[PDB]
Structures are given as C-alpha cells and as structure tokens.
Amino acid sequence: KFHTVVPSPQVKCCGSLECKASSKADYTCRVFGGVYPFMWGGAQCFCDS
Amino acid sequence: ITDDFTLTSPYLGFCPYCRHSAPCFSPIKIENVWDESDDGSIRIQVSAQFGY
Amino acid sequence: ITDDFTLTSPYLGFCPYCRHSAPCFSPIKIENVWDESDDGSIRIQVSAQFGYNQAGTADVTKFRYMSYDHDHDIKEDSMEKLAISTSGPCRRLGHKGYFLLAQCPPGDSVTVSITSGASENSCTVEKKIRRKFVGREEYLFPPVHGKLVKCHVYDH
Amino acid sequence: NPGAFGDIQASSLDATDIVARTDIRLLKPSVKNIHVPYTQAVSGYEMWK
Amino acid sequence: TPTVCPVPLAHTPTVTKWFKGITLHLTATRPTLLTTRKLGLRADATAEWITGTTSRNFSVGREGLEYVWGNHEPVRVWAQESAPGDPHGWPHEIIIHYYHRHPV
Amino acid sequence: LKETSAGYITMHRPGPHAYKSYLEEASGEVYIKPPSGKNVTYECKCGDYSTGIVSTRTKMNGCTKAKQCIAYKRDQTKWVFNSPDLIRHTDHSVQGKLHIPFRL
Amino acid sequence: ATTHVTATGSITLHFSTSSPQANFIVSLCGKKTTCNAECKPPADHIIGE
Amino acid sequence: NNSGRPLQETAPFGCKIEVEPLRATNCAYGHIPISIDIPDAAFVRSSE
Ligand SMILES: *[C@@H]1O[C@H](CO)[C@@H](O)[C@H](O)[C@H]1NC(C)=O
Incomplete structure (x- = not known):
C-alpha cells in the first residue's frame, strides 16, 4: 500500500512561474494561473488573477 | 537528524468538518489515519502538538 | 391575523413513550416531524413553548427560557436542559414558538428530552430518517472541491 | 498498470529509487481558500488483497 | 429556501478503443450513477449504479453516442469505419470489409 | 510505548503568512499598525515591488488602495510539517526529521 | 469558400468526403474542373466531432 | 420511489x-x- 505526498503548493503571486520535472516516483506537476489563495489570515497576496 | 520536539510549532489547517458542519479552518486538522493493525488500534496524525 | 405569541400557552399531550417506556401524558408531546430538507435538517413541533418567556409573563422574548405546563399551571425552565436524539445527541440549530429546527444522523425514532434537575421527561415518535444527498452519486459529506448545484435547505 | 498488483515497485524495501505510475491527475483549484485537489485510482495492492 | 450547495466531481473515466464500440474503465469509491443514450431513432436509454471499479463495454451507435458520468457535463462520441476496404491493385477479400460494415 | 524505530517524517521552515489586522484603511490613505513589540514586513506593487520593515512602527506607502499592501509577521523560528494548507518559503529545503511513534 | 488569385498561383484546399472513391467536379471561381482520386479508411474509428 | 428515469436520459x-x-x-x-x-447589390458583376 502506498501514500500520496502532497507538498505545500508553491505560489508565485503577481508574477509568472513554470513547471519543473523531478526524479521522485509518479511525480506529477502542474501550474495554474488566475488562482487567488485565501487563508485564515486573509488574502495571501494582491493581484487580480 | 534528531528527535527534539521544541523546535516545531502547530500549524493551522483546513478541516472539511467543523462544529457547524461546514468546512472551515481549525487547529486540529487530520490528514492521515492508519488502521492496518490486527488488534484494531488506530493512529491519528493531527495538526496540533500534544504530549509535550 | 398576527404573529404575537404572548396570547397562547402550552397544552398537555399524550405521548406513546415516556421515561418508563409506556404511553402516558406529558407536556412535550410531538405530533409533527418534517424531513424533506436536502441538507438533513429536521423540524420538530412540540407541545411546549420555548424561545419565549412564560406565556403571559411581563417579558415575552427570552432565548434561555422554555415555557411549559404541568400541575394546573404554566412555568419556565432553563432552555439549556433540552436535548434531541435519533441515534445519538443532535445539535440544536434554532427555535421559535412551538417549532424547532435540529439535525442529527439517521436512525429509527426521534426523541426530545428535558431534565428537571431531579426528574427527566422524554417523548419520542417513530420516523424513518435516512441520510440523503443531491447529485448523481451518493457521498457521505460534501467535499471541499466540486461543482455547485441547486438544492433546498431549511433557513436557519 | 494502475488499479492492479504491482502499482508501486521498488528493488528493495528501503531503496531511495522508486518507479511507479498510478494515474494521478491534478484539478484546478475552485475554492476560496488554498487547497490542491488530487484525484487518483484506488490502490492496486488493496484490490489484489 | 433554495440555495447553492457543493457536490463532488467523480474520478474521470478512461476511454479505450473498440471497433464500433467503447470500453470504459470506470473507477469509483462510492455509489455513482452512470447513464448513456444513443442519438438515433432508438433512444436505447441505459442507466446503472456502480459501487466500486470495473470495466463496461458499450456498443457505440453508428450515428453517435452520449456519455454521462458523475456530476460533470456529458460528452458526445461518434464512430466511423476502419475495416480494410480498398484493395491494393491485387486480388483481395474486399467483401470482409463490407461484412464488417453493413453485414446484411 | 512511546519509543519507535519505524517511519520517517520530514520537517522544514514555514512560509509567509498574511493578515488584515496589520493594515487599516479607514481613511483614504493607507494605514499599517503592526502588533506592538513585533517586527513586520510589508509589500505592495504600486509602481514597483516596494517592501519595508517595521519594528513596532507604522510606515507608509504612496499607493492608497486597501488591497494593495500585505504584511508578514515573519519569524522563521519553528519548523512545520508539510501540508496542503500551508505555503513554502522560497528556499524550499528540508531541515529536520522526526519519528512517528506507536509503530507496528 | 473564397481564395486569393494570382497570375499563375496554385492553392491547397481541405475537404471532407463520405466515400472512398473521391471523384467529383470542383468549381473554381466561374470555371469547372473534374478530377478524382482514391482515399483510405482511417486508423482512429471513434471521434466526437 | 419508482418514478423511473427522467426524459433527459x-x-x-x-x-x-x-x-x-x-x-x-x-x-x-x-x-x-x-x-x-439576396439583395441585388450584394452581387458583383463578372466584369470585375
Ligand atoms: C526587527 O529586526 C531588526 C533586525 O535585526 C532589529 O534590529 C529590530 O530590533 C527588530 N525589531 C523588533 C521590535 O524586534
């Protein structure tokens, strides 16, 4: 039986970022633009998409 | 590597349940549960720190 | 027509259940139960009045009060001593006049109980409560991520 | 082959190198807060068991 | 009162290849209701409840086929011919192609 | 028993954290009130990625919009387990390990 | 439907047919041209367009 | 309980x-x- 690791998502906010491959097994990567993170403290950054 | 524990802190988590039965932030987030033990015991990994 | 509640009082009822597990009289008779809500909320109509002061008191609105009747007289009680159970404690959600809105997992009966410090009175009724949910797949709880769909829920 | 025995394979139990694919596809966040939604097939080992 | 509520997005299936057909590797962990229908004169409505995971065949209609699964929107998949019809200048069993399509 | 000799859990320093109480916008001009006796960093992009450090101080920025500038109470003292509900410091490095108790 | 015309230009076009023997008459501007060829069945036999 | 499938399917x-x-x-x-x-003006003379 296996266990899927879900490391904390990287956020490059009010900027641009690109995916990078790695060596870990089953590694799957994907970027998303227009996201808008929110947290208990509030908006974690400042830019419309 | 080490086993000292005073060097870490508890982290707020996002739990699907809350006292009002809707997802919300909380300090007792659970993200892992193991029950393979034949005796029936269950390990729970919570966000907070206890025992110390 | 109106909505004033100080003009009405509670009424003794006959419940199939009591503390001693046989039909008997009680001031907590329930004659109606609705379950159509998609969320799972349950409306319970009891014979007592809560959410208001003792019917006819100087003050009429008080959340902590619970107006009921016995011994040829009406009187109050601390509303915190009211519990609801189907297969285990339910979480009270709202109360007004005769009616209250609660929620708890499924079972086979609905029970409403009050402890009077030294004695307890509970009344219950059979009702086929079964968990239901909307969508083309029956889940356990609505997960964090997914589509948004129209449904109907009891306003709180 | 996802959903079958031998979905996770390793030369040794504690081999740092692992080779395995189990059809993990990410989903675009669609919630107010921060959350990475993942979706994968059921573990093959459990199905074989 | 009517209101918006959330619902899960079931794991997306995998589409395979099958001459004048499809095979779906349906994977789910909780009961899920799948439905499908042709687009021709005959509705050929089909519905099912799936508990775990399995594989299901579907005779895709020649004109087209609908596909509904989970809570997400449906898709339309159509089919065509793939038998070896045209010859290559030498004697051939061309009839087999016309046996695969319009056998009667 | 508390003692264990199986498992290996990672740990690394925390990411940044945002807050609303650090900034006030009752008037048209921005206002930042970091908690008393506590360092704070503030950042906003109007014109440029202007950033500043305040030690129990209320520094100001030219741009006025409430949403514009955000504040971190950066301490980077205690490590934290990786979880989807956190954010990663730009370094993205593993700092320590811990034992999962009560093992088979 | 329409294309630019030069003194001696030649232009490629895209078309679909429901028969293997693709023989027909094509009108370019006001003139006509009869012409024919042979097509083959495709490898992919299910599509949704 | 037994109404059957709706008309969408x-x-x-x-x-x-x-x-x-x-x-x-x-x-x-x-x-x-x-x-x-079609309006006549939409047409274009063959001369041009
Ligand atoms: C903030 O950090 C600087 C950098 O060392 C330090 O000089 C200052 O005293 C700190 N302020 C507070 C309030 O701790």
Whole structure:
C-alpha cells in the first residue's frame, strides 16, 4: 500500500512561474494561473488573477 | 537528524468538518489515519502538538 | 391575523413513550416531524413553548427560557436542559414558538428530552430518517472541491 | 498498470529509487481558500488483497 | 429556501478503443450513477449504479453516442469505419470489409 | 510505548503568512499598525515591488488602495510539517526529521 | 469558400468526403474542373466531432 | 420511489429539455427547405 505526498503548493503571486520535472516516483506537476489563495489570515497576496 | 520536539510549532489547517458542519479552518486538522493493525488500534496524525 | 405569541400557552399531550417506556401524558408531546430538507435538517413541533418567556409573563422574548405546563399551571425552565436524539445527541440549530429546527444522523425514532434537575421527561415518535444527498452519486459529506448545484435547505 | 498488483515497485524495501505510475491527475483549484485537489485510482495492492 | 450547495466531481473515466464500440474503465469509491443514450431513432436509454471499479463495454451507435458520468457535463462520441476496404491493385477479400460494415 | 524505530517524517521552515489586522484603511490613505513589540514586513506593487520593515512602527506607502499592501509577521523560528494548507518559503529545503511513534 | 488569385498561383484546399472513391467536379471561381482520386479508411474509428 | 428515469436520459436525438417553457433544444432530425432572398447589390458583376 502506498501514500500520496502532497507538498505545500508553491505560489508565485503577481508574477509568472513554470513547471519543473523531478526524479521522485509518479511525480506529477502542474501550474495554474488566475488562482487567488485565501487563508485564515486573509488574502495571501494582491493581484487580480 | 534528531528527535527534539521544541523546535516545531502547530500549524493551522483546513478541516472539511467543523462544529457547524461546514468546512472551515481549525487547529486540529487530520490528514492521515492508519488502521492496518490486527488488534484494531488506530493512529491519528493531527495538526496540533500534544504530549509535550 | 398576527404573529404575537404572548396570547397562547402550552397544552398537555399524550405521548406513546415516556421515561418508563409506556404511553402516558406529558407536556412535550410531538405530533409533527418534517424531513424533506436536502441538507438533513429536521423540524420538530412540540407541545411546549420555548424561545419565549412564560406565556403571559411581563417579558415575552427570552432565548434561555422554555415555557411549559404541568400541575394546573404554566412555568419556565432553563432552555439549556433540552436535548434531541435519533441515534445519538443532535445539535440544536434554532427555535421559535412551538417549532424547532435540529439535525442529527439517521436512525429509527426521534426523541426530545428535558431534565428537571431531579426528574427527566422524554417523548419520542417513530420516523424513518435516512441520510440523503443531491447529485448523481451518493457521498457521505460534501467535499471541499466540486461543482455547485441547486438544492433546498431549511433557513436557519 | 494502475488499479492492479504491482502499482508501486521498488528493488528493495528501503531503496531511495522508486518507479511507479498510478494515474494521478491534478484539478484546478475552485475554492476560496488554498487547497490542491488530487484525484487518483484506488490502490492496486488493496484490490489484489 | 433554495440555495447553492457543493457536490463532488467523480474520478474521470478512461476511454479505450473498440471497433464500433467503447470500453470504459470506470473507477469509483462510492455509489455513482452512470447513464448513456444513443442519438438515433432508438433512444436505447441505459442507466446503472456502480459501487466500486470495473470495466463496461458499450456498443457505440453508428450515428453517435452520449456519455454521462458523475456530476460533470456529458460528452458526445461518434464512430466511423476502419475495416480494410480498398484493395491494393491485387486480388483481395474486399467483401470482409463490407461484412464488417453493413453485414446484411 | 512511546519509543519507535519505524517511519520517517520530514520537517522544514514555514512560509509567509498574511493578515488584515496589520493594515487599516479607514481613511483614504493607507494605514499599517503592526502588533506592538513585533517586527513586520510589508509589500505592495504600486509602481514597483516596494517592501519595508517595521519594528513596532507604522510606515507608509504612496499607493492608497486597501488591497494593495500585505504584511508578514515573519519569524522563521519553528519548523512545520508539510501540508496542503500551508505555503513554502522560497528556499524550499528540508531541515529536520522526526519519528512517528506507536509503530507496528 | 473564397481564395486569393494570382497570375499563375496554385492553392491547397481541405475537404471532407463520405466515400472512398473521391471523384467529383470542383468549381473554381466561374470555371469547372473534374478530377478524382482514391482515399483510405482511417486508423482512429471513434471521434466526437 | 419508482418514478423511473427522467426524459433527459431517454429523449432521442439528444434533445436538451428545459422546464420553464418546457421546450426541447439543440437536437437534430429532418430536412429544412429554405428560400433565401439576396439583395441585388450584394452581387458583383463578372466584369470585375
Ligand atoms: C526587527 O529586526 C531588526 C533586525 O535585526 C532589529 O534590529 C529590530 O530590533 C527588530 N525589531 C523588533 C521590535 O524586534
């Protein structure tokens, strides 16, 4: 039986970022633009998409 | 590597349940549960720190 | 027509259940139960009045009060001593006049109980409560991520 | 082959190198807060068991 | 009162290849209701409840086929011919192609 | 028993954290009130990625919009387990390990 | 439907047919041209367009 | 309990049915004969 690791998502906010491959097994990567993170403290950054 | 524990802190988590039965932030987030033990015991990994 | 509640009082009822597990009289008779809500909320109509002061008191609105009747007289009680159970404690959600809105997992009966410090009175009724949910797949709880769909829920 | 025995394979139990694919596809966040939604097939080992 | 509520997005299936057909590797962990229908004169409505995971065949209609699964929107998949019809200048069993399509 | 000799859990320093109480916008001009006796960093992009450090101080920025500038109470003292509900410091490095108790 | 015309230009076009023997008459501007060829069945036999 | 499947999973030709007018939409069957009238000015003389 296996266990899927879900490391904390990287956020490059009010900027641009690109995916990078790695060596870990089953590694799957994907970027998303227009996201808008929110947290208990509030908006974690400042830019419309 | 080490086993000292005073060097870490508890982290707020996002739990699907809350006292009002809707997802919300909380300090007792659970993200892992193991029950393979034949005796029936269950390990729970919570966000907070206890025992110390 | 109106909505004033100080003009009405509670009424003794006959419940199939009591503390001693046989039909008997009680001031907590329930004659109606609705379950159509998609969320799972349950409306319970009891014979007592809560959410208001003792019917006819100087003050009429008080959340902590619970107006009921016995011994040829009406009187109050601390509303915190009211519990609801189907297969285990339910979480009270709202109360007004005769009616209250609660929620708890499924079972086979609905029970409403009050402890009077030294004695307890509970009344219950059979009702086929079964968990239901909307969508083309029956889940356990609505997960964090997914589509948004129209449904109907009891306003709180 | 996802959903079958031998979905996770390793030369040794504690081999740092692992080779395995189990059809993990990410989903675009669609919630107010921060959350990475993942979706994968059921573990093959459990199905074989 | 009517209101918006959330619902899960079931794991997306995998589409395979099958001459004048499809095979779906349906994977789910909780009961899920799948439905499908042709687009021709005959509705050929089909519905099912799936508990775990399995594989299901579907005779895709020649004109087209609908596909509904989970809570997400449906898709339309159509089919065509793939038998070896045209010859290559030498004697051939061309009839087999016309046996695969319009056998009667 | 508390003692264990199986498992290996990672740990690394925390990411940044945002807050609303650090900034006030009752008037048209921005206002930042970091908690008393506590360092704070503030950042906003109007014109440029202007950033500043305040030690129990209320520094100001030219741009006025409430949403514009955000504040971190950066301490980077205690490590934290990786979880989807956190954010990663730009370094993205593993700092320590811990034992999962009560093992088979 | 329409294309630019030069003194001696030649232009490629895209078309679909429901028969293997693709023989027909094509009108370019006001003139006509009869012409024919042979097509083959495709490898992919299910599509949704 | 036993009402059966709705019409969204039985309508032939993939009619998408909306309740409030109670109308089907976006499904195909049959042939439409249509007569179209074009203004003369839209035409271009063969000379040019
Ligand atoms: C903030 O950090 C600087 C950098 O060392 C230090 O000089 C200052 O005293 C700190 N302020 C507070 C309030 O701790």
